[PDB]
Structure formats: structure tokens, C-alpha cells
Write a protein that binds this ligand. Sequence first.
Ligand SMILES: C[C@H](CCC(=O)NCCS(=O)(=O)O)[C@H]1CC[C@H]2[C@@H]3[C@H](O)C[C@@H]4C[C@H](O)CC[C@]4(C)[C@H]3C[C@H](O)[C@]12C
Ligand SMILES: C[C@H](CCC(=O)NCCS(=O)(=O)O)[C@H]1CC[C@H]2[C@@H]3[C@H](O)C[C@@H]4C[C@H](O)CC[C@]4(C)[C@H]3C[C@H](O)[C@]12C
Ligand SMILES: C[C@H](CCC(=O)NCCS(=O)(=O)O)[C@H]1CC[C@H]2[C@@H]3[C@H](O)C[C@@H]4C[C@H](O)CC[C@]4(C)[C@H]3C[C@H](O)[C@]12C
Ligand SMILES: [Cl-]
Ligand SMILES: [Cl-]
Ligand SMILES: [Cl-]
Lengths: 220, 218, 219
Amino acid sequence: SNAMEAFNSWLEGQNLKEQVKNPNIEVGDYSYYSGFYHSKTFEEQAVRYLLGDAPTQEVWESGQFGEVDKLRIGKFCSIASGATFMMAGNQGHRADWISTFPFSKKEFGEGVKDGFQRAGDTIVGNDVWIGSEAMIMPGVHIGDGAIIGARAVITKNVAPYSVVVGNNVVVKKRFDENLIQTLLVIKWWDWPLQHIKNTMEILCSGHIEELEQYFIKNVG
Amino acid sequence: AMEAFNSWLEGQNLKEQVKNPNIEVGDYSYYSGFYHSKTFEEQAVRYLLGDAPTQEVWESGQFGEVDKLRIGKFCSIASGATFMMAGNQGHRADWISTFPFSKKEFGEGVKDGFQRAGDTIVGNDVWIGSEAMIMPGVHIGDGAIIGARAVITKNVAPYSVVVGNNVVVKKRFDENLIQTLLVIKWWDWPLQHIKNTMEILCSGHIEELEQYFIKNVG
Amino acid sequence: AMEAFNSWLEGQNLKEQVKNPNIEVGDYSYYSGFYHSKTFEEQAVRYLLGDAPTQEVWESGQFGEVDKLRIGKFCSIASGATFMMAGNQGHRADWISTFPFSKKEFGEGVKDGFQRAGDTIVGNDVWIGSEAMIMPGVHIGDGAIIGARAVITKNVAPYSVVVGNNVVVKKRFDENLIQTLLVIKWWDWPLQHIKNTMEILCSGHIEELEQYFIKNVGS
Ligand SMILES: C[C@H](CCC(=O)NCCS(=O)(=O)O)[C@H]1CC[C@H]2[C@@H]3[C@H](O)C[C@@H]4C[C@H](O)CC[C@]4(C)[C@H]3C[C@H](O)[C@]12C
Ligand SMILES: C[C@H](CCC(=O)NCCS(=O)(=O)O)[C@H]1CC[C@H]2[C@@H]3[C@H](O)C[C@@H]4C[C@H](O)CC[C@]4(C)[C@H]3C[C@H](O)[C@]12C
Ligand SMILES: C[C@H](CCC(=O)NCCS(=O)(=O)O)[C@H]1CC[C@H]2[C@@H]3[C@H](O)C[C@@H]4C[C@H](O)CC[C@]4(C)[C@H]3C[C@H](O)[C@]12C
Ligand SMILES: [Cl-]
Ligand SMILES: [Cl-]
Ligand SMILES: [Cl-]
């Protein structure tokens, strides 16, 4: 028989907050990875080159690395199969040095300088839908409510409630600016769970103004 | 079934292999998937109810009518090309949240956001390059060529060459010669006529192909 | 298991591993393939006759000459980057059909539509990002950088940075400094001189590298 896979069907999603173990990843409530078509868990397949994962754990716990770029994911995010977070910044390749090659001191002597540069944290905000096989490059911030298209290659920050495909192409904003601004103040992802339950009929609709009134009367 | 590929020299005839009732594929169309290992139904056609991991739930008769994958004759589908089915998979960009709240977690106010996209329709004599992704509901007209790694979200006119993010590079022939191919439809000819005309098909001589049609096919 | 990557800290020296007669790769170039598992010749180089699935077929001689994959020195090839060989794979966009009719199925009128694209040539000091796809016939010049997930179908000039659908983002350096690097070619220096200049190579001081060349290397 063959080696098991992480998912038994594409009907299944994995709650990330209950699963993730890398101290360098932070994932908020309800966010899930539906990874059936790429076989492996979120931490072994989707999050790449993050020190402290399974293949680098023993090396990370030696404590000789210093701080690295972290991956922070908000609440209520939908991460589709094969979506990829590229960590570890430039992975030691300096486009501004004469060579991008990572000469080893073992082969090229003591003149070698380390070209690793942090890119900063990768941040995914709340209520973000990341389509299948999108690739998120180091250091980007994807604002709340954004949609990343399948196969998108995201190298720039994504404004809240933007829809972005391909080579950072913003194809629309989900709502008008005034209503976007409204969702960013009331922040329904931060409400107590019973208030989200109570307003579920409004969240499964386009009536932002109804949502804003529920906030005024009940949440505040 | 899970008949593998021994090398990239071999393709898999699709009409003889596919079992999903929601997939239609015509004669001679194949999948050359050596570099992605698994079968066309397992690896290339994604999120289609009735496939291997969801055959049980589909046979239970719960969902009704889903979008189908329709593929014509004489198509060439390269390793890792993917057809994305199941519409918006329940995410509604026009609702406040895209999150698919479960009833068992968020109560009865949950509304099902699923929306079909319509069938995915691929015509005849279409060439789909390696690791292209075909998004839900797209129609790809006869004779079109999809570049490797293309991400196709709009309909593709017959005999056009499309790459990248729906970038139409060109059309394969002049408009009048396209129209001639779309009338004569060599992919529907009796096999003897395709064989007899094979020396013309392996050329650019469309009007000589039309001469053959007028005189022998009718 | 020995050819497996144990972690993404691990890279495979290509000149010591590659066996396909139709691949040439220079000193020190490597493949960091942990996230796509298989070796460089199994996963990155595609449709090249003489690889493992087609060795016995290529042993016969049925085919003659095919496009080769040529990679220079000091190239960094990230996981899942792909080199597409075998040219048009017998699909002729200028013929009425792109379908590769087999003679067993359609008879003796079948004509072979295969056309070579030319060798795929990667220069020296090239960095190819993860899951980029290099299409047949492409020349990638010295010092170039190919972004992650780029799809390269046109030639890449020296020291250019290319992403997406052949998008030229920038050149790494001013034109004059690129010219200086294309003259002095540090990748061809005796190893003693590469070591001695390591402190310069690990910086942006091209004119200092030129000073080293003039005073110690220049033929
Ligand atoms: C596997 C995906 C995520 C599952 C998950 O883990 N949800 C957590 C929600 S919660 O924190 O417990 O509220 C879910 C999300 C949406 C699901 C899809 C949507 O529900 C729409 C249809 C519904 C059909 O019954 C099955 C196919 C399907 C296309 C679903 C397939 C699959 O189960 C999906 C894609
Ligand atoms: C695996 C591909 C499809 C195989 C298939 O199933 N054909 C069905 C035709 S038919 O209904 O029986 O008429 C075939 C089609 C074209 C083939 C390529 C072309 O024939 C061109 C060359 C020819 C060389 O002999 C092998 C490499 C190669 C580059 C071939 C590799 C591979 O065998 C290809 C790519
Ligand atoms: C696996 C990669 C290549 C290994 C290799 O084959 N080197 C050969 C050079 S030489 O002929 O022996 O001179 C190396 C090159 C750059 C390395 C990265 C850079 O060195 C930057 C940091 C350094 C940290 O110690 C580990 C993570 C890391 C992000 C490294 C991970 C990994 O080991 C990388 C990516
Ligand atoms: Cl999903
Ligand atoms: Cl093919
Ligand atoms: Cl690397």
C-alpha cells in the first residue's frame, strides 16, 4: 500500500489554529486549509522555508539563528489547495551583490559574507480567500477581505477587499469605498461568537449597512 | 482506475478511461500526464462531484445538477493541465464574508453561498499546454491553443492562441480559413476520410482540405 | 533515499549528479529541490530524450539529434523550476490540426510535425526562482534573475530580472557595470582568484572587482 496523505477528500478542510505547531506561524480562529489536491499538511506543503518546521526543528531549537520572518494569518481565512507562502526572505541571494550565488565557506574560504536579508513578516488579514496554487512572496501584507485569485503571484501589498490575480493585477474591489471603510471599523471577525452567530443572516448577504446597524445596537 | 504512465512518450486515451458521469470526452483526445503521475480524473479534473473521493456522496442523490466538464475530439492535454470545477465552491465575493461558515459551528442563520458556473466546454482539436489551469465555466472553441501555465478565465475564440492571464497572442489562420474549418468539421468525418486526408491535415493547406470535403464528404 | 532531500537546507551539486548526455551543467551550480522531492533530472528537466524513462529508447538511435539543456557555472536553481525540452513535441500550430496522429491509428499519410527549438542555454551566475518554467529554445544570459513562477519564452538579456509572462522588471546594475562584468567573467577565473576576491564578490563593488581583474587576472 502507498503512504497516507493529509486529506481523504476535497470536501475536507483542516482548521489551522488547532493544527499548526511552528512557533514562527500564528493563525487565527476558524481559518482552514483545504489541501486535498496537494497531499500534505499546511505546514509541510503550503508554508515554505520557515525555520522551525519539521525538517529544521532540531536546528531551530539550538537557538543560534536569531529572529526570522514570521507568517501571521488572521481569522476566517479560506486557503485553497496548493496555496504557497514563501518564507526566508531572499534565502541568501543578493541581487545587489556581484553574484547571487551562496558561496560556502567550506568551498570558497573565509572571505564569504552571509547575504541573508529578512523581508519582514508575511501577514494575511481577516476574511481573506486565497485561491488554489497562489504564491505569496516574502514580506507582503494582504489586507482584510481580500481575494487572491487561483495561481496569482503576490509580490506587493494587497489593499483590503481587493481582488488580485496573476502578476499583482487588482481587477476590482468587492465593495464601494464607503462600505469597505465601514467593514474596517466594525471588524465583525473580532465580535464575540454569539454576535457573529446572531448576524449570520446578514453576513451571508451583501447588506453591509444592516451589519453596521447591528453593530451600533448590539456590539459597540 | 489508476493506470500510470511509464514514460512521457505515452498518453492516455481519455474516452476509454474516464468514468465520471459528469465528464464527457470525445474520440482520440488524450492526457499525457507522466510528470504529474496520477490519472486525468485524479489530478487534472478537480472538485467535480462524482470523482473518486466523492463517488459515495454523489451517488446518494443530494446535490442535483452540477457543472460538467465537456471535451471534444482530437484534443491534446499536456501534463498537469487542470480543469477547476464546482463553481465558486461556496465563496461569494458579493456577500460580506467569503468564509463558508458551517451550520454545526455557526447555527441556522447560515446561507449556502454555492453558485454554479455553467459547464466547462472544450471543443475539438484543442491543444492545452502543461500546467495550464482552466477556471470554471470557460468555453474553449475548436482549434484553440492554450499555452503552458496559462490561467484561462474567459472564453477562448476558435483557433486562437492564448497564454498567461488570458492573453490572446494571435489566431492560427485568417478569418475566412477559420470559417472554412468551422463549416467542414474534419473531426466529425468518417475515419476513412480523415485517414485519406491525413497528408492534407499535416499541412497548412486548408483550402485543399475544403476541396477534399466538397468532392468526397459532402 | 540517498538522492532525497532531507530538508530545504540541502542543495544538490548538479555537475556531480547529472548523467543525461543531453544535459551540460557547469561547476558549482545546484538544485535546491526539497519541496518537489525528486531529483533534478526527474522533476526539473522535462521531455529530454536520454533521461531515465527514455534511456533505452535513446540508446537505439531512432531519433538523431535533439535540443540539449546547457547550464553554466554558479547557477542557483530553486525547487520545482522546470526546463521544458523536446521543442514543439510534434504539435504544429501552422498545420490544420495540432493533434499528433499516430501511424498505427491513421495510416501512412501521417507526417512528423516535430521541430527543434534549439538548445536551452542558461548562462553563468543565474538564479532561477521556485516553480519558474523555462520554455524550449530560450537563452538566459549571464547574471540574470528569473522570478519565482515566471514563464520564460523569450531570450533573457544578461543581468536582467524577469518575472511573470516575460516581464523585464529591471537590470541589476547600470549598463557600463554590466559591460565590465561581461568582460572580466569572474566565473571563469582560476579558483584561487575567486577565493581571494570573495570579499568583493559578496558586495556590490563591481569597480573593485575590476581592479582585482586588472591587477591580478587580466590576460
Ligand atoms: C473543504 C472546504 C473547507 C471545509 C472546512 O473545513 N470548513 C470549515 C468551516 S467552519 O470553521 O467549521 O465554520 C469546504 C469549504 C466550502 C466547501 C464547498 C461548499 O460548501 C459548496 C459545495 C457544497 C457541496 O455539498 C459539496 C461541494 C462543495 C463545493 C463544498 C466542497 C468542500 O467541502 C468546501 C470547499
Ligand atoms: C505522449 C504524447 C501523446 C501520445 C498519444 O497518446 N498519442 C495519441 C495519438 S493516436 O490517437 O494513437 O493517433 C505524444 C504526442 C507527441 C509525442 C512527441 C512527438 O511524437 C515528437 C517526438 C518523437 C520521438 O519519437 C519521441 C519524443 C517526441 C517529443 C514525442 C514524445 C511523446 O511521445 C509525444 C509528446
Ligand atoms: C539549499 C541552498 C543551497 C545549498 C547548496 O547547494 N550550496 C552550495 C554552495 S557551494 O557550491 O558548496 O559553494 C542554500 C543556499 C542558500 C541557503 C540559505 C541562506 O544561506 C540563508 C539562510 C541561512 C540559514 O542558516 C538557514 C536558512 C537559509 C535561508 C539558507 C537555507 C538553505 O541552506 C540555502 C537556500
Ligand atoms: Cl476552499
Ligand atoms: Cl502533449
Ligand atoms: Cl536556492
